[PDB]
Design an enzyme around this catalytic site. Sequence first.
Site, PDB file in Angstrom:
ATOM      1  N   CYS B  44       0.877  -1.156   0.000  1.00 46.56           N
ATOM      2  CA  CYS B  44       0.000   0.000   0.000  1.00 46.56           C
ATOM      3  C   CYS B  44       0.918   1.211   0.000  1.00 46.56           C
ATOM      4  CB  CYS B  44      -0.867  -0.013   1.253  1.00 46.56           C
ATOM      5  SG  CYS B  44      -1.956   1.404   1.389  1.00 46.56           S
ATOM      6  N   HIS B  45       0.435   2.355  -0.467  1.00 49.07           N
ATOM      7  CA  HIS B  45       1.296   3.527  -0.496  1.00 49.07           C
ATOM      8  C   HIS B  45       1.743   3.925   0.903  1.00 49.07           C
ATOM      9  CE1 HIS B  45       2.836   6.445  -3.440  1.00 49.07           C
ATOM     10  NE2 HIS B  45       3.175   7.068  -2.324  1.00 49.07           N
ATOM     11  N   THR B  46       0.920   3.584   1.889  1.00 50.08           N
ATOM     12  CA  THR B  46       1.204   3.897   3.282  1.00 50.08           C
ATOM     13  C   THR B  46       2.488   3.206   3.758  1.00 50.08           C
ATOM     14  OG1 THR B  46      -1.197   3.978   3.593  1.00 50.08           O
ATOM     15  CG2 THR B  46       0.168   4.067   5.561  1.00 50.08           C
ATOM     16  N   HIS B  66       0.876  -4.169   5.652  1.00 44.92           N
ATOM     17  CA  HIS B  66      -0.393  -4.232   6.356  1.00 44.92           C
ATOM     18  C   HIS B  66      -1.527  -4.775   5.485  1.00 44.92           C
ATOM     19  CE1 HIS B  66      -0.096  -0.336   4.404  1.00 44.92           C
ATOM     20  NE2 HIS B  66      -1.402  -0.168   4.515  1.00 44.92           N
ATOM     21  N   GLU B  67      -1.173  -5.227   4.283  1.00 44.97           N
ATOM     22  CA  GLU B  67      -2.128  -5.825   3.344  1.00 44.97           C
ATOM     23  C   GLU B  67      -1.706  -7.274   3.126  1.00 44.97           C
ATOM     24  OE1 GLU B  67      -2.379  -3.828  -0.408  1.00 44.97           O
ATOM     25  OE2 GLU B  67      -3.861  -2.360   0.270  1.00 44.97           O
ATOM     26  N   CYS B  96     -11.680  -4.863  19.544  1.00 44.69           N
ATOM     27  CA  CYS B  96     -11.710  -5.527  20.848  1.00 44.69           C
ATOM     28  C   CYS B  96     -13.142  -5.956  21.142  1.00 44.69           C
ATOM     29  CB  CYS B  96     -11.253  -4.567  21.943  1.00 44.69           C
ATOM     30  SG  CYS B  96     -12.505  -3.325  22.368  1.00 44.69           S
ATOM     31  N   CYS B  99     -14.525  -1.878  23.972  1.00 39.86           N
ATOM     32  CA  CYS B  99     -14.131  -0.533  24.377  1.00 39.86           C
ATOM     33  C   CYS B  99     -15.218   0.474  23.993  1.00 39.86           C
ATOM     34  CB  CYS B  99     -12.800  -0.127  23.738  1.00 39.86           C
ATOM     35  SG  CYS B  99     -12.907   0.375  22.020  1.00 39.86           S
ATOM     36  N   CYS B 102     -15.560   0.538  20.063  1.00 44.43           N
ATOM     37  CA  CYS B 102     -16.154  -0.652  19.453  1.00 44.43           C
ATOM     38  C   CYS B 102     -17.645  -0.726  19.701  1.00 44.43           C
ATOM     39  CB  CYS B 102     -15.487  -1.931  19.967  1.00 44.43           C
ATOM     40  SG  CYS B 102     -13.839  -2.238  19.279  1.00 44.43           S
ATOM     41  N   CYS B 110     -11.120   1.251  17.228  1.00 42.64           N
ATOM     42  CA  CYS B 110     -10.864   0.654  18.530  1.00 42.64           C
ATOM     43  C   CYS B 110      -9.542   1.250  19.039  1.00 42.64           C
ATOM     44  CB  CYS B 110     -10.747  -0.865  18.377  1.00 42.64           C
ATOM     45  SG  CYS B 110     -10.396  -1.747  19.893  1.00 42.64           S
ATOM     46  N   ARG B 114      -3.988   0.887  20.426  1.00 40.19           N
ATOM     47  CA  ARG B 114      -3.463   1.916  19.542  1.00 40.19           C
ATOM     48  C   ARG B 114      -2.099   2.468  19.973  1.00 40.19           C
ATOM     49  NH1 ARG B 114      -1.412   4.605  16.809  1.00 40.19           N
ATOM     50  NH2 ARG B 114      -2.059   5.850  14.986  1.00 40.19           N
ATOM     51  N   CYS B 173      -6.546  -3.533   3.158  1.00 35.44           N
ATOM     52  CA  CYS B 173      -6.485  -2.082   3.197  1.00 35.44           C
ATOM     53  C   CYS B 173      -7.129  -1.338   2.034  1.00 35.44           C
ATOM     54  CB  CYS B 173      -5.038  -1.633   3.341  1.00 35.44           C
ATOM     55  SG  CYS B 173      -4.924   0.107   3.631  1.00 35.44           S
ATOM     56  N   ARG B 368      -1.803  -2.437  -7.640  1.00 33.04           N
ATOM     57  CA  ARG B 368      -1.404  -3.322  -6.561  1.00 33.04           C
ATOM     58  C   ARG B 368      -0.555  -4.471  -7.094  1.00 33.04           C
ATOM     59  NH1 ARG B 368      -2.533   0.040  -3.556  1.00 33.04           N
ATOM     60  NH2 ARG B 368      -3.318  -0.067  -1.397  1.00 33.04           N
TER      61      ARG B 368
HETATM   62  N1  LIG Z   1      -7.443   6.311   5.183  1.00 34.80           N
HETATM   63  C1  LIG Z   1      -7.010   5.075   4.923  1.00 34.80           C
HETATM   64  O1  LIG Z   1      -7.400   4.140   5.657  1.00 34.80           O
HETATM   65  C2  LIG Z   1      -6.177   4.838   3.882  1.00 34.80           C
HETATM   66  C3  LIG Z   1      -6.092   3.585   3.384  1.00 34.80           C
HETATM   67  C4  LIG Z   1      -5.306   3.277   2.355  1.00 34.80           C
HETATM   68  C5  LIG Z   1      -4.582   4.331   1.809  1.00 34.80           C
HETATM   69  N2  LIG Z   1      -4.660   5.576   2.290  1.00 34.80           N
HETATM   70  C6  LIG Z   1      -3.949   6.691   1.621  1.00 34.80           C
HETATM   71  O2  LIG Z   1      -4.642   7.008   0.389  1.00 34.80           O
HETATM   72  C7  LIG Z   1      -3.719   7.450  -0.630  1.00 34.80           C
HETATM   73  C8  LIG Z   1      -3.700   6.472  -1.811  1.00 34.80           C
HETATM   74  O3  LIG Z   1      -3.206   5.106  -1.561  1.00 34.80           O
HETATM   75  P1  LIG Z   1      -2.880   4.084  -2.767  1.00 34.80           P
HETATM   76  O4  LIG Z   1      -2.491   2.739  -2.251  1.00 34.80           O
HETATM   77  O5  LIG Z   1      -4.078   3.996  -3.633  1.00 34.80           O
HETATM   78  O6  LIG Z   1      -1.634   4.790  -3.508  1.00 34.80           O
HETATM   79  P2  LIG Z   1      -1.525   5.165  -5.074  1.00 34.80           P
HETATM   80  O7  LIG Z   1      -0.109   5.368  -5.468  1.00 34.80           O
HETATM   81  O8  LIG Z   1      -2.092   4.098  -5.937  1.00 34.80           O
HETATM   82  O9  LIG Z   1      -2.398   6.528  -5.207  1.00 34.80           O
HETATM   83  C9  LIG Z   1      -1.805   7.706  -5.838  1.00 34.80           C
HETATM   84  C10 LIG Z   1      -2.594   8.052  -7.099  1.00 34.80           C
HETATM   85  O10 LIG Z   1      -3.000   9.429  -7.022  1.00 34.80           O
HETATM   86  C11 LIG Z   1      -2.411  10.095  -8.124  1.00 34.80           C
HETATM   87  N3  LIG Z   1      -2.075  11.458  -7.770  1.00 34.80           N
HETATM   88  C12 LIG Z   1      -0.962  11.901  -7.066  1.00 34.80           C
HETATM   89  N4  LIG Z   1      -0.896  13.284  -6.974  1.00 34.80           N
HETATM   90  C13 LIG Z   1      -2.020  13.691  -7.654  1.00 34.80           C
HETATM   91  C14 LIG Z   1      -2.469  14.981  -7.867  1.00 34.80           C
HETATM   92  N5  LIG Z   1      -1.777  16.066  -7.447  1.00 34.80           N
HETATM   93  N6  LIG Z   1      -3.657  15.135  -8.571  1.00 34.80           N
HETATM   94  C15 LIG Z   1      -4.361  14.015  -9.042  1.00 34.80           C
HETATM   95  N7  LIG Z   1      -3.913  12.708  -8.832  1.00 34.80           N
HETATM   96  C16 LIG Z   1      -2.722  12.619  -8.123  1.00 34.80           C
HETATM   97  C17 LIG Z   1      -1.125   9.288  -8.370  1.00 34.80           C
HETATM   98  O11 LIG Z   1      -0.602   9.596  -9.672  1.00 34.80           O
HETATM   99  C18 LIG Z   1      -1.724   7.866  -8.362  1.00 34.80           C
HETATM  100  O12 LIG Z   1      -2.574   7.697  -9.502  1.00 34.80           O
HETATM  101  C19 LIG Z   1      -2.354   7.476   0.087  1.00 34.80           C
HETATM  102  O13 LIG Z   1      -2.244   8.704   0.809  1.00 34.80           O
HETATM  103  C20 LIG Z   1      -2.563   6.297   1.081  1.00 34.80           C
HETATM  104  O14 LIG Z   1      -1.597   6.361   2.139  1.00 34.80           O
HETATM  105  C21 LIG Z   1      -5.451   5.836   3.334  1.00 34.80           C
HETATM  106  N1  LIG Z   2       0.567   8.183  11.504  1.00 34.03           N
HETATM  107  C1  LIG Z   2      -0.204   9.214  10.793  1.00 34.03           C
HETATM  108  C2  LIG Z   2      -1.626   8.688  10.578  1.00 34.03           C
HETATM  109  C3  LIG Z   2      -1.635   7.676   9.422  1.00 34.03           C
HETATM  110  C4  LIG Z   2      -3.042   7.179   9.183  1.00 34.03           C
HETATM  111  O1  LIG Z   2      -3.940   7.983   9.002  1.00 34.03           O
HETATM  112  N2  LIG Z   2      -3.303   5.840   9.185  1.00 34.03           N
HETATM  113  C5  LIG Z   2      -4.649   5.324   8.863  1.00 34.03           C
HETATM  114  C6  LIG Z   2      -4.519   4.058   7.991  1.00 34.03           C
HETATM  115  S1  LIG Z   2      -3.784   4.481   6.387  1.00 34.03           S
HETATM  116  C7  LIG Z   2      -3.979   2.912   5.519  1.00 34.03           C
HETATM  117  O2  LIG Z   2      -2.721   2.532   4.962  1.00 34.03           O
HETATM  118  C8  LIG Z   2      -5.359   5.009  10.166  1.00 34.03           C
HETATM  119  O3  LIG Z   2      -5.556   3.855  10.513  1.00 34.03           O
HETATM  120  N3  LIG Z   2      -5.758   6.045  10.948  1.00 34.03           N
HETATM  121  C9  LIG Z   2      -6.218   5.844  12.333  1.00 34.03           C
HETATM  122  C10 LIG Z   2      -5.075   6.069  13.295  1.00 34.03           C
HETATM  123  O4  LIG Z   2      -3.968   6.360  12.880  1.00 34.03           O
HETATM  124  O5  LIG Z   2      -5.290   5.941  14.612  1.00 34.03           O
HETATM  125  C11 LIG Z   2      -0.246  10.482  11.620  1.00 34.03           C
HETATM  126  O6  LIG Z   2      -0.091  10.427  12.823  1.00 34.03           O
HETATM  127  O7  LIG Z   2      -0.455  11.669  11.029  1.00 34.03           O
HETATM  128 ZN   LIG Z   3     -12.363  -1.743  20.956  1.00 36.71          ZN
HETATM  129 ZN   LIG Z   4      -2.880   1.072   3.492  1.00 33.38          ZN
END
Ligand SMILES: NC(=O)c1ccc[n+]([C@@H]2O[C@H](COP(=O)([O-])OP(=O)(O)OC[C@H]3O[C@@H](n4cnc5c(N)ncnc54)[C@H](O)[C@@H]3O)[C@@H](O)[C@H]2O)c1
Ligand SMILES: N[C@@H](CCC(=O)N[C@@H](CSCO)C(=O)NCC(=O)O)C(=O)O
Ligand SMILES: [Zn+2]
Ligand SMILES: [Zn+2]
Lengths: 373, 373
Positions: B44-46, B66-67, B96, B99, B102, B110, B114, B173, B368
């Site tokens: 994942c990009h994360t 994480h995937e 859990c 909590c 949950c 949860c 954390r 993820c 992916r």
């Molecule tokens: N909130 C969550 O639980 C959660 C879960 C998974 C991922 N994320 C975050 O979501 C984002 C995407 O993850 P991913 O696995 O799909 O990565 P990814 O590399 O596939 O996503 C990036 C995409 O966005 C495009 N992009 C980048 N800059 C851009 C811009 N300025 N304008 C338009 N498009 C642009 C990139 O070219 C690529 O197509 C990352 O920040 C990831 O960490 C969050």
């Molecule tokens: N450590 C960062 C926060 C990163 C973040 O937002 N993580 C998401 C999952 S991203 C999926 O790859 C998340 O689970 N958020 C809930 C949490 O972090 O408790 C920061 O501190 O800025």
């Molecule tokens: Zn919980």
């Molecule tokens: Zn992720």
Amino acid sequence: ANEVIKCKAAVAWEAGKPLSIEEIEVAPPKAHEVRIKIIATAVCHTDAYTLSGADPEGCFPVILGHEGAGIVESVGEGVTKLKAGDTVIPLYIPQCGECKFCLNPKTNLCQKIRVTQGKGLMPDGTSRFTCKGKTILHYMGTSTFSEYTVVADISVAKIDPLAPLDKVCLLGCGISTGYGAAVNTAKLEPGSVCAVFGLGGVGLAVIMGCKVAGASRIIGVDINKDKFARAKEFGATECINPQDFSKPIQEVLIEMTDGGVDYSFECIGNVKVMRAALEACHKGWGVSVVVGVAASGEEIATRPFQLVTGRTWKGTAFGGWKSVESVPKLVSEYMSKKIKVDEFVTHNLSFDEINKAFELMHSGKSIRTVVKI
Amino acid sequence: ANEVIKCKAAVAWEAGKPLSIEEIEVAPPKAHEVRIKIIATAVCHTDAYTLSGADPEGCFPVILGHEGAGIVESVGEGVTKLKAGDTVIPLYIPQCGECKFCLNPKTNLCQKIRVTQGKGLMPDGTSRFTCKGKTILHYMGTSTFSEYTVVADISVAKIDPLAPLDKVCLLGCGISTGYGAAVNTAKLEPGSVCAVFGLGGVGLAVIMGCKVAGASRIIGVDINKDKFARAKEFGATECINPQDFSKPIQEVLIEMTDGGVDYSFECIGNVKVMRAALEACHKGWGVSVVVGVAASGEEIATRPFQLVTGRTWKGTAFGGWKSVESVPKLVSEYMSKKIKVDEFVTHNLSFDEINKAFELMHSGKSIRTVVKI
Ligand SMILES: NC(=O)c1ccc[n+]([C@@H]2O[C@H](COP(=O)([O-])OP(=O)(O)OC[C@H]3O[C@@H](n4cnc5c(N)ncnc54)[C@H](O)[C@@H]3O)[C@@H](O)[C@H]2O)c1
Ligand SMILES: N[C@@H](CCC(=O)N[C@@H](CSCO)C(=O)NCC(=O)O)C(=O)O
Ligand SMILES: [Zn+2]
Ligand SMILES: [Zn+2]
Ligand SMILES: NC(=O)c1ccc[n+]([C@@H]2O[C@H](COP(=O)([O-])OP(=O)(O)OC[C@H]3O[C@@H](n4cnc5c(N)ncnc54)[C@H](O)[C@@H]3O)[C@@H](O)[C@H]2O)c1
Ligand SMILES: [K+]
Ligand SMILES: [Zn+2]
Ligand SMILES: [Zn+2]
């Protein structure tokens, strides 16, 4: 036939100057317009904001005022729902009922006449006011600071003929906005913990709604300790003054609620406080509603981690009420004692002392001042 | 009892450098812990986000990932609901089940572990990883870049045995997140107008989600036009490259949609883009969901006017899914052909060549890449 009316009105000739009670001429209603006789009108910070000249959209000379109540004196052609003698309340947020917004349940921001209203003119693109040969502009589509005003027919709410106008005129802005903010925008569930930043008319109206919603906790926040007593009267379980803490107000609230509040409301217009109000919300489900209007240019900010971790940022306009439908109902809730209005009146003045209203406002010794025309 | 395991893992000793295939040791499951044999895992990009150092809580050395998906190798004291042989998916967001969070239907965050998890440690404050005498840290509670990993017993989803692990590991993820961002966080209604910024794995899952919700227009937005083809295959009605326009992307969207989108989703992690996504929303009811993870310290901003006039700012984590309850149902929906997973896999590699997986991501060449352990 409807003739021109010669009456008194508080004209604002220039920005930064006090209002001037002047003899003016009010033209007769044109098609889809209604002429109203204002019986009572209150003053809000919004009127003062445009008066100062800080408002980029403010033009002069103009007739301010957007919190009034009165009686229909006459109606233009095409007007059916309203007739001379109806008890009414002018609305700065109209409700045409057919535009894209009026037809969408999630908003109340009718746009049918916004453009023309921002320029202080009736829908036909012309003003109905004249004074000493000069054209005086309309304000917020209402201009309640005149013995007689003309409004778009879509800017009127017919209310209970028994409602005291020197009271109910406040439902034209502050009370409805605060109340609706809690009940319409947040829709807080019974037992939720709420926080309210700013304890003026809006903040108090918000507290009022939280209490009717059945909030278990309602924390008032204000730098002016004087506002606490009335807030408690309205339902605030407790009040706190940021100045009494060295830590950021967010951290304080988080401590007080073991995580933060379920709902928070910013009723000041301070961008920094707005951020605090958001951050003070409980992680995962906290909601923060912005009710206060910040000075143009100013912007809010925070770390996206705050939204990602479950918090929601919202805002509200006139408590999200569809004006024409809602206001009559709000008046009825007042008549039923379901909501408070009289309690918001802290001062009463005659039309000539109208300038003192602005003075009481700056003194901070005021919630709402009702001016008897 | 359970003995220590001598196996292979991709260890990231220091940030800004490619992983290192190392022969490590994996301790057995302590009370309420589960040791899983990882059969497949993706990037994942994360994972790259952390490897670069922009993570507020990024510590080294650590085993990322994480995937993933695999089989329960064994369980620690008190583990009743999970046994050796169970097909499972490691969850970076636990459940859990008791909590404060949950038990609240409005969130899935949860907090039970954390704190410890943020430090890359098991609930008891220690790590089960060691390599060359040096203690190696966990990551997001899953550390899937190892033949064997140990997780808290509340970070485990028991899924359908029949599920192809080299596919459903993606539900750990990206897919689940994007999908839930639409169905759980936004809860978009049928016929709504959507915009999705960032057309990567998450973004396509968002599109997929809008499609099942019955969205009308789904506008994909990405600087890499090579992402458009697949975006349209997932449901995007059309794609636009921000670079092909002189006006800020918000104005473009506002123009294309006669006022803005009903829902927008930022799936990139760009704070400036997050602001555009919010301002691309329609007045009075527009909602923007932040999914992308921003770099430490950076903040999003906008004029509060945007909120006061109807727009709402939200965010999400793992698509708002109650991890232990949902993931099993999600693989079911994959099995029933209700949602896609296979169409997310653009590349496949063996464990030894895992770094290639990162290169492809930075190259933007993939969505992916499933690494066969
Ligand atoms: N909130 C969550 O639980 C959660 C879960 C998974 C991922 N994320 C975050 O979501 C984002 C995407 O993850 P991913 O696995 O799909 O990565 P990814 O590399 O596939 O996503 C990036 C995409 O966005 C495009 N992009 C980048 N800059 C851009 C811009 N300025 N304008 C338009 N498009 C642009 C990139 O070219 C690529 O197509 C990352 O920040 C990831 O960490 C969050
Ligand atoms: N450590 C960062 C926060 C990163 C973040 O937002 N993580 C998401 C999952 S991203 C999926 O790859 C998340 O689970 N958020 C809930 C949490 O972090 O408790 C920061 O501190 O800025
Ligand atoms: Zn919980
Ligand atoms: Zn992720
Ligand atoms: N959204 C709407 O439709 C709508 C409608 C009407 C008014 N408003 C806005 O609501 C806001 C409040 O209006 P009001 O009539 O109640 O005005 P008000 O000035 O009487 O109320 C504000 C209170 O905030 C307190 N305060 C100032 N700084 C503070 C701080 N840092 N922390 C805590 N408290 C602080 C002030 O002492 C005052 O008591 C203004 O922005 C007004 O323009 C919005
Ligand atoms: K919704
Ligand atoms: Zn007002
Ligand atoms: Zn309308």
